[PDB]
Amino acid sequence: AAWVKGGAADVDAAVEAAADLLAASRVPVLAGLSAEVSALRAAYRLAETLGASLDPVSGPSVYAELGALSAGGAMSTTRAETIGRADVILIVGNRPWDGELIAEIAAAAPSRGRAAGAERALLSLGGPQNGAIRHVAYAADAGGLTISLGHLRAFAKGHLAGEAAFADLAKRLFAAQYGVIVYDPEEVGELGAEMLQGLIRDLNESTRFFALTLADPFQGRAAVQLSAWTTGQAPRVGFGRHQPEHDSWRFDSARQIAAGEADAALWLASLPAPRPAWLGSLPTIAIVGEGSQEAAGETAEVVITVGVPGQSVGGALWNDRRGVIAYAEASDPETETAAGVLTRIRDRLIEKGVS
Amino acid sequence: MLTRIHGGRVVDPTAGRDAVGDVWIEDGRVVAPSERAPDQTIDATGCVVMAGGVEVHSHIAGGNVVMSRLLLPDLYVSESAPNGHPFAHAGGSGSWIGANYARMGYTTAVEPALPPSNALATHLELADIPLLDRGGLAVLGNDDHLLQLLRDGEGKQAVRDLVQQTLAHSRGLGVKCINAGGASAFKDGVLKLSLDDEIPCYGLSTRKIMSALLDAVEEIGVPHPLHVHCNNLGLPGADDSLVATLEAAEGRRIHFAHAQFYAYGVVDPGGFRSAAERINAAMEAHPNATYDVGQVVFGQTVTISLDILRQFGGRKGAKPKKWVISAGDAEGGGVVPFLYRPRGPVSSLQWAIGLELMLLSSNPERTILTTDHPNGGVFTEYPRIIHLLMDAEERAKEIATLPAIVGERSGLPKIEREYSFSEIAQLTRSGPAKLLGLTDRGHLREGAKADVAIYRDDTDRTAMFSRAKLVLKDGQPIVEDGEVVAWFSGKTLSLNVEADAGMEKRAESYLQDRFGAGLDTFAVPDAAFPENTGTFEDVACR
Amino acid sequence: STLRLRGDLPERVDLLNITPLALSGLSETEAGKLAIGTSRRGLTLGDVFEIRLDGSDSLVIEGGSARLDRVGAALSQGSIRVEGDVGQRLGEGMAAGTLTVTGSAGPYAGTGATGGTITIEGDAGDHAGGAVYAAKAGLDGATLVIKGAAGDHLGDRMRRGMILAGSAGAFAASRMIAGTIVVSGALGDHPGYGMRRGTLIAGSHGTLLPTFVETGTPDLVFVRLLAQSLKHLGAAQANLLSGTLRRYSGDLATLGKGELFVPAH
Ligand SMILES: [Zn+2]
Ligand SMILES: [Zn+2]
């Protein structure tokens, strides 16, 4: 069911109302982008015809990692190979402790590689001092994790005197066979990640070390993958000049809305995502799942309920465990898809351009 | 719809045709000359007519190709495209590489690094490439599953079941191997690896894995032989590694990828000599062997390879000084940007060896032309290499600017033979399709797919092959006078093979204990693609 | 040549290649039709400004908004004066010349500037003198003068040139490749994070990184030269080098070749 103005149920007419809203605006925005790859593909295809900008909700976490690797590069590994091969694991921050990943590592020793079957050492920087899982915790510096990360690299480079807290940590890291530093780029920051990735480059002068960059839970990592092969650049790209302009600052939806540059915006949230709270200020088109609380017609000017991928309809989603795009079939599900709506709005916008 | 293309010099080396004549195509396929009036007639004044270009080795899709566009947003120039097809002029995008291949007359492009782990995202990326038909080569030889099978000695039957399962689940055209065991050795602290060197934790050579994959490929019957990425890429002395790997095949059908990077002589026991003559000699002594060159193009580019062992070795030579190495699951991948200096003593030799290998070949069908895009160079330079092979006076024009080392360490200025159109058709259409097993693509005889490339004659072959007068995809015109007119999606070629039911349940228990997820995360369902069941086209196994 | 801003900007505007060298070549009526708008609806130079043109290397924009991106970018000749505030990327890739702004400036101002002098009489935004996304370097040789106070990440990944700021925010001189930054007054917390090479001089300073070690109070010949360089340019930061200074070595996470000078007491 759809909603236009005061509760207009018709799905076809809601597509026409969304096409009229996007055509009348000069600066359009496509925020959210938490859905299937087919919907992301249709959203980027619509923005190319519209001349709009895009910004996933995972924006800050995505560009915290992208900002450090587009300038400094990366030395990374996967979750399965960390559980399978790593003998010493450094856990930076509190966010990696949320998932079951930390318990899977502790429960079983590595099963593959040179260090398979050896005793596993778990070191933590900035994590809780007392945990159910036994680990060696190292106190974070007063400045923060980013200051601690730079502090730690100095001991690893041999630039700072011995007998310090991070000096023992540096000694334990270099004495490795398969080293993995697990961190969340959101909480660590662009500068800390580039430092963290540099610390790994210094560690690889002696033994093999890698980074387990944590993934966002709002499909942002798949949006990067798709946008990269569709536009040639990362997300936050604008098509005002028919060519994809990448500008992490200019096409930041949070920045655009607060300044007042964007007239209209399209919200893509087939899977649960945090509400942006600006939907009421400017005319918005909300493509959301049927189960979500955002289904009601008060949230946005035009609201279209689509099929939740992995629950009511099939779709290729980012797999948290696997670390790649995988197709998730519907768990006990004719309903409309977010890709089918964005394509129909694009077809109606093209139809208006001819006559 | 009946179409008649007369007046042009039709070049088809598989039938022996190098003379002007008619080409009749009906219902998207080449038919015998019908004595009835055709619906449309295409006039080619001169305009040498060739088959659809086939690309065998080009890094066009994958997680690593995504990473390269993130690391180097400046690599490919995006021009303003008013009234142009979406993303066709957006430099680096899948649509950009698709449209640019069609402009040169190429209608088929094969991806050599299809990872079985991230198969869906690689195929979703391949599907988004427009116009061309595409293919993916499943990569084996570095995943724990196959290596545990070889470590225990499960037998040639058991290995066949696993190679069949992976080919089916990943929807790949053929089998590839990128430095067998090099990844499972780099993860265990190994930096250099040779074809015989024992790899840690499995106690096996890389020839042991290659010989096992060579058995499986012959047994299953893949029309394309084993696509092989040898040991010690780019290291002085790889001529010794490629040759010993060729002799390790024991007469089996193989294909060496980007062999140019291996023809580096050892000379003094600080420098390196060209080994093109040594490799071309071994290629004639082994008739079952084939190889694609991988010619080096001067300028800024990026090297995308799943040989993490070698990409980590040359990581410090990256220009700009930034690199992404990922060691994950099987091989992961390594992306380091590289600039081939326009006057560089190393770059000029690499550029000379690429041509020398092609100029020495007796049969260009076995010496397929590639750039190893983008590792060696950008694929848009194919018209230049064709111009350099066909024209001897332009080859000496380029050699005049390069330093003396080119003549003193290669011998390319001494070999002054020109290449013909029939031999260029062996490089770009005939040879590549015969290798890949696509019987209906390399030629223009009655029975072929209507993939036609018409180039307007020019003394400057660079312009002749850069903008094709007319290119046809299954009978429909896609580009005219070098500009794309049509915009539709092709089909991904996947070998039709059935996964063993007893092997599928055996792999399921393995994947659940290593990853925590079933086969569905590795599967490539039709419902994920924009064209449900219309994205793939079956290929029969010989 | 004077461009009188008619009014408030409805969208972001890109003033690239709007250099007096380019305007002089184009006809006065033809120059008005030049589109500078970001959006699909766009905006032409005539819609935004009242164009008065003459064959000169001097340009003056009368009136300014924070939506003037890439103003003075790739400037190779002459001068451009903005009587007002400006947007991001002040003189991106400026080859040579002079670029003065009466008001304040947007973020990423001064990126990739090779030569010339960019002067902001107001305050600079975040990432002032810093590298943009994926950029190889920030300031790459043009000297940047900020009479006011810069925000966070001043001189971020700076490669060459000189920055003359009144006051500076946190994480100043981060990821610095090389250069010299002299802020006359306050400096934010954690300065020079990831510094490889370069010279940072400040009057006040916040909390220093644990990877910065003090060398002492050394009378160096370079300091004498840098002082005379600031005196000749008329810098207010010239007085800061008169007295004896305290030195700190560049961040030990990267190669520790950078430095930081602060007055003794
Ligand atoms: Zn490869
Ligand atoms: Zn390769």
The bridge status of strand B174-178 relative to strand B133-139 is parallel
- Taking alpha carbons only, the member of C70, C101, C97, C95 closest to residue C83 is C101
B346 C-alpha to ligand 2 centroid (Å): 19
d(CA B303, CA A97): 36
Distance from CA of B94 to the nearest CA of C (A): 21
d(CA C242, CA C236): 12
Contact check, Cβ <8 Å, B73/C136: no
Beta-carbon neighbour count of residue A47 at 10 Å? 25
d(CA B320, CA C163): 26
Partners of A141 on chain C (C-beta within 8 Å) are 210
d(CA C265, CA C259): 18
Contact A42, A227 (CB under 8 A): no
Burial class for C242, CB neighbours closer than 10 Å (0-12, 13-18, 19+): exposed
Partners of B324 on chain C (C-beta within 8 Å) are none
Question: Quick one: CA dihedral A63, A64, A66, A70, positive or negative?
Answer: positive
* Percentages (nearest 5) of helix, strand, coil residues in chain B: 35, 25, 40
Beta-carbon neighbour count of residue A9 at 10 Å? 11
Cross-chain CB nearest to C39 (options A142, A154, A240)? A240
Distance from CA of A165 to the nearest CA of C (A): 13
Question: Quick one: CA dihedral A122, A128, A134, A140, positive or negative?
Answer: positive
Contact B73, C134 (CB under 8 A): yes
Contact check, Cβ <8 Å, C252/A153: yes
Contact check, Cβ <8 Å, B323/A73: yes
The residue to which tokens 């590595």 are assigned: A110
Q: Would you call C237 helix, strand, or coil by DSSP?
A: helix
Contact check, Cβ <8 Å, A154/C107: no
Tokens of B153: 């000695």
Q: Would you call B462 helix, strand, or coil by DSSP?
A: helix
Biggest CA-to-CA distance, chain A: 77
Cross-chain CB nearest to C253 (options A63, A198, A249)? A198
Please provide residue B354's backbone torsions phi and psi, each rounded to the nearest 5 degrees: -55, -50
- For chain A, give the residues followed by a break (C–N over 2.5 Å): 333
- Omega before residue B320 within 30° of 0, cis: yes
Contact C108, C128 (CB under 8 A): yes
Contact C164, A78 (CB under 8 A): no
Q: Which of C43, C133, C257 to mutate to test the interface with A (most CBs of A within 10 A)?
A: C133
d(CA B156, CA B139): 18
Distance from CA of A307 to the nearest CA of B (A): 15
Structurally, chain C folds into a number of domains equal to 1
* Helix locations, B221-370, DSSP H: 238-248, 276-285, 308-313, 345-360
d(CA C125, CA C103): 12
Partners of B320 on chain C (C-beta within 8 Å) are 136
Question: Residue B285: CB partners within 8 Å, gap ≥ 6?
Answer: none
Q: Would you call B213 helix, strand, or coil by DSSP?
A: helix
Please provide residue C152's backbone torsions phi and psi, each rounded to the nearest 5 degrees: -75, 150
d(CA A154, CA C126): 27
Structural domain boundaries enclosing C166: 1-265
B327 C-alpha to ligand 1 centroid (Å): 14
Q: Which three-class secondary structure string do you get for chain A? A: CEEECCCCCCHHHHHHHHHHHHHHCCCEEEEEEECCHHHHHHHHHHHHHHCCEEEECCHHHHHHHHHHHHHHEEEEECHHHHHHHCCEEEEECCHHHCCCHHHHHHHCCCCCCCCCCCCCEEEEECCCCCCCCCCEEECCCCCCHHHHHHHHHHHHCCCCCCCCHHHHHHHHHHCCCCEEEEECHHHHCHHHHHHHHHHHHHHCCCCCEEEEECCCCCCHHHHHHHHHHHHCCCCCEECCCCCCEECCCCCCHHHHHHHCCCCEEEEEECCCCCCCCCCCCCCEEEEEECCCHHHCCCCCCEEEEECCECCCECEEEECCCCCCEEEECCCCCCCCCHHHHHHHHHHHHHHHHHC
B178 C-alpha to ligand 1 centroid (Å): 7
Tokens of B340: 């081939």
Question: Quick one: CA dihedral A293, A299, A300, A303, positive or negative?
Answer: positive
- Omega before residue B200 within 30° of 0, cis: no
Angle at A195 between CA A190 and CA A199, to 5 degrees: 145
**Ligand in nearest proximity to the CA of B376:** 2
Distance of CA B428 to the CA centre of its chain: 11
B223 lies within 8 A of chain C by CB? no
d(CA A335, CA A165): 58
d(CA A169, CA A156): 9
A280 C-alpha to ligand 2 centroid (Å): 52
- Taking alpha carbons only, the member of A105, A198, A96, A101 closest to residue A146 is A198
B319 lies within 8 A of chain C by CB? no
**Ligand in nearest proximity to the CA of B333:** 1
Question: Residue B83: CB partners within 8 Å, gap ≥ 6?
Answer: none
Contact B258, B290 (CB under 8 A): no
Torsion angle defined by CA atoms of residues B514, B518, B523 and B527, in that order, rounded to the nearest 10 degrees: -150
Residue C170: in which H helix or E strand, if any?
none
Angle at B30 between CA B25 and CA B34, to 5 degrees: 60
Contact C191, C173 (CB under 8 A): yes
What is the length of chain B? 542
Contact check, Cβ <8 Å, B320/C136: yes
Q: Determine the residue of chain B that is closest to A85 in CA distance.
A: B187
The DSSP symbol for B258 reads S
- Taking alpha carbons only, the member of B185, B166, B186 closest to residue B176 is B166
Provide residues of A within 8 Å CB-CB of chain C.
26-27, 50-51, 63, 66-67, 70-71, 141-143, 146-147, 150-151, 153-154, 157, 159-160, 191, 194-195, 198-199, 238, 240-241, 246-250, 261
* β-strand partners of A264: A28
Contact B272, B349 (CB under 8 A): yes
Q: Which three-class secondary structure string do you get for C86-126? A: CCCCCCCCCCCCEEEECCCCCCCCCCCCCCCEEEECCCCCC
Tokens of C57: 């290397």
Contact A211, A125 (CB under 8 A): no
Question: Residue B262: CB partners within 8 Å, gap ≥ 6?
Answer: B230, B232, B233, B238, B239, B241, B242, B256, B275, B279
d(CA B411, CA B356): 8
Contact check, Cβ <8 Å, B87/A38: no
Q: Determine the residue of chain C that is closest to B73 in CA distance.
A: C134
Q: Determine the residue of chain A that is closest to B71 in CA distance.
A: A70
The residue to which tokens 């004498």 are assigned: C224
Partners of A49 on chain B (C-beta within 8 Å) are 86
Tokens of B486: 């049509």
Tokens of B406: 């080119």
* DSSP string for B101-132: HHHTTEEEEEEEEE-STTHHHHHHHHHHSBSS
Cross-chain CB nearest to A327 (options B323, B523, B530)? B523
* β-strand partners of A213: A183
Beta-carbon neighbour count of residue A253 at 10 Å? 24
Q: Which of C8, C9, C12, C175 to mutate to test the interface with A (most CBs of A within 10 A)?
A: C12
- Taking alpha carbons only, the member of A35, A5, A43, A56 closest to residue A252 is A56
Resolution (A): 3.1
In chain C, beta strands by DSSP E: 2-5, 13-14, 49-52, 58-62, 68-69, 79-83, 98-101, 117-120, 143-149, 162-167, 180-183, 199-202, 214-216, 245-249, 259-263
The DSSP symbol for C37 reads B
Crossing angle for the helix pair B144-152 and B501-514, nearest 10 degrees?
A: 110
Partners of A63 on chain C (C-beta within 8 Å) are 133
Tokens of A137: 């915790």
Tokens of B436: 């890949």
- Taking alpha carbons only, the member of C149, C142, C199, C206 closest to residue C173 is C199
d(CA B285, CA A99): 58
The residue to which tokens 């402009």 are assigned: B103
Crossing angle for the helix pair A59-72 and B63-71, nearest 10 degrees?
A: 80
Tokens of B40: 């449309």
- Taking alpha carbons only, the member of A293, A287, A272 closest to residue A338 is A287
Cross-chain CB nearest to B70 (options A66, A208, A323)? A66
Please provide residue A226's backbone torsions phi and psi, each rounded to the nearest 5 degrees: -70, -50
Tell me the residue type at A172.
Answer: R
Beta-carbon neighbour count of residue B515 at 10 Å? 21
Tokens of B535: 């994205």
Contact check, Cβ <8 Å, B320/C134: no
B255 C-alpha to ligand 1 centroid (Å): 14
B176 C-alpha to ligand 2 centroid (Å): 10
The residue to which tokens 């990360």 are assigned: A149
Provide the residue ranges of all domains of chain A, joining segments of one domain with +.
1-60+214-355, 61-213
Residue C107, Ramachandran bin (φ over 0: left; ψ between -120 and 50: alpha; else beta)? beta
d(CA B66, CA B522): 19
Question: Residue A42: CB partners within 8 Å, gap ≥ 6?
Answer: A338, A339, A342, A343, A346
The bridge status of strand C245-249 relative to strand C214-216 is antiparallel
Distance from CA of B119 to the nearest CA of C (A): 29
Tokens of C94: 């400026």
Please provide residue B373's backbone torsions phi and psi, each rounded to the nearest 5 degrees: -55, 130
Q: Which three-class secondary structure string do you get for B34-86? A: CCCCCCEEEEEEEEEEEECEEECCECCCCHHHHHHHHHCCCCCCCCCCCCCCC
Method of elucidation: X-ray
Q: Determine the residue of chain B that is closest to A339 in CA distance.
A: B530
Cross-chain CB nearest to B322 (options A73, A208, A329)? A73
Residue B174: in which H helix or E strand, if any?
strand B174-178
* DSSP string for C56-97: -SEEEEES--TTEETTTTT--SSEEEEES---S-TTTT--SS
Q: Would you call B133 helix, strand, or coil by DSSP?
A: strand
Contact A90, A156 (CB under 8 A): no
* β-strand partners of A306: A289
Size of interface B-C (CB pairs under 8 A): 3
B155 lies within 8 A of chain C by CB? no
Tokens of A182: 């697990």
Distance from CA of A175 to the nearest CA of C (A): 19
Tokens of A267: 């919200």
Distance from CA of A262 to the nearest CA of B (A): 23
Q: Would you call B472 helix, strand, or coil by DSSP?
A: strand
